[PDB]
Structures are given as C-alpha cells and as structure tokens.
Amino acid sequence: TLDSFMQPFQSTLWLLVGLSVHVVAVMLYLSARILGMVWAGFAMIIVASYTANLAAFLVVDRPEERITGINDPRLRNPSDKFIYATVKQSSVDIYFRRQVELSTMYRHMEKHNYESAAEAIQAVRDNKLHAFIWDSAVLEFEASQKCDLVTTGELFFRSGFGIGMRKDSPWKQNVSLSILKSHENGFMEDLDKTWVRYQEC
Amino acid sequence: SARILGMVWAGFAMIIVASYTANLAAFLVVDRPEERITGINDPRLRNPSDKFIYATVKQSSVDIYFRRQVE
C-alpha cells in the first residue's frame, strides 16, 4: 500500500527545497518582490512535479505475478529466481524426458530436486522455490488443508482415472454400464463435495 | 459562521480541483488509439462490421484462392 514515500528519494528534494528557502530568505534579507515571486513559482512547479512523480510511481505496481500456463515466457529459461522442482523418480520425470521440445526446461528440473512430497510442500513454505509440478487432486487437496498456498494455472496433459480390468474379463461391460448411469445421475458430484474439497480456506 | 463556511467552501473547491486534475491526467495518459491492422489473425480481421468494409477486385487470382479455405 501507500508506504514507500521515503523510498522515492524524497529526502534529496526536501533538502534542496530547504536550502533554496534558506537562500531566498538570505537574499531577501540582503528586489525582494522578484525573489519572492520566483520562490512562489518554484514552489508551485515543485508541487506539480512531486504530484506527477507520485502519480507515476503509483502507476507502477510490479503486477503480473504468479503464473499463467506451461508455455508462458517465464517457463522457458529459468535464471535463478524460479528454480522449480519436480519430484524425481515419478511419472513426471519420465514425461519430461520424452517431450523433445522441453529439453532446456528439463535440464533445470535436474537441478535441485526432491525425494518426497512432504519435504517439497514444506519447502514451499520455506520460501526458496517458487513453483511445483505434480498431479492435480493431490495439489488441490494439499492447498485446501494447509491453507498456505493457492492452486493456480491451467491444466495440461489430460487423462482419465479409469477402472482397470483384465482383457476380455467376464465383467467387461456391466461395470461400464453402471459407471455411466451413475456418472450422469449426480453421484460423482456428491462424492466430490463430500471428500475432495473442503471449506476451511 | 462566516469563517467556518468560508473554510469549508475553500476545502470543497480544492477537492474539486484535485479531482479534476486527477481525471485530466488519467485521460491524458489513457489516450492511445493507434493499433493499425496487423496480419491474418486479428480481432478486426476475424469478424465483420460496417466500419471495415474491405474489398478485392473480383474474379482475379486472390479471390479464387481466398474462397476455398473453409476455415
């Protein structure tokens, strides 16, 4: 909020104004009308300039923080302030060693890296890394309970948590029928409300 | 009550002047129409209007090709 008044180096302007006022007083003590008019005009001009500079500084706010997507500019050359860590030896590493274009990306993911979800999400609180790359439901849940960090960004690399069954197994169809009839009959929404999302946040 | 009324009126005039100055400065900063048409993917060059009737000489080289693209 409006607190960086001294950060704008207003001390130098204040000192210059004080010195000029002292000089004007000395000159008037030592013609006075012209000097007084000059001082008044200088004060008005300085007021206008200070107001303009304050407005310009207020315009700048360092916006466009957080993140937008996976193809957004920041995620194509990490300098040193976006060291984002995957969770090496997962499916995620495999998926970053088989998408050719992402090569440079992958390189820096093989810099500082973790060996468990727990220490990772803790380090997000430890304020070193500024990102994380790991699947969806776990993330939204973790964001819910430990109401410290909000999910963001879009989705990519879609998929579906099916129910697996042996090839041409005797129930190859009936489970499909039931899952559809449920999946439209307002069941998954009920279960999702009761288990996957919370409201402490 | 003359002094209080005068002080209040002067404050109101100063507030009005400050608001007017702020609005004028914002309007001056805002004005930047420019934005000439650019290419093949533009909001102006993606949908019709009445202010952008653009043409091309009929039955000639461009128009034939520029018809097959179902996209």
Partner: peptide
C-alpha cells in the same frame, strides 16, 4: 468589479494551464 473579474479569469486560466502542464508531465513519464 472589473479588476476582480480580470483576476478571477487570470486565476482560472492559470489553473487550467497548470493542470495541462501536470498532465503533460505525467504523460511524458
């Protein structure tokens, strides 16, 4: 009467000019 009106007109012109100058200074920033 006449002097007061002239002074008020000069003040209004000066205020408009100062507002324009401040706006220009902000725009050039």
């Amino acid at each position: 009467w006449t002097g007061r009106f002239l002074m008020n007109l000069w003040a209004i012109f000066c205020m408009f000019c100062l507002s324009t100058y401040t706006a220009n200074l902000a725009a050039v920033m």
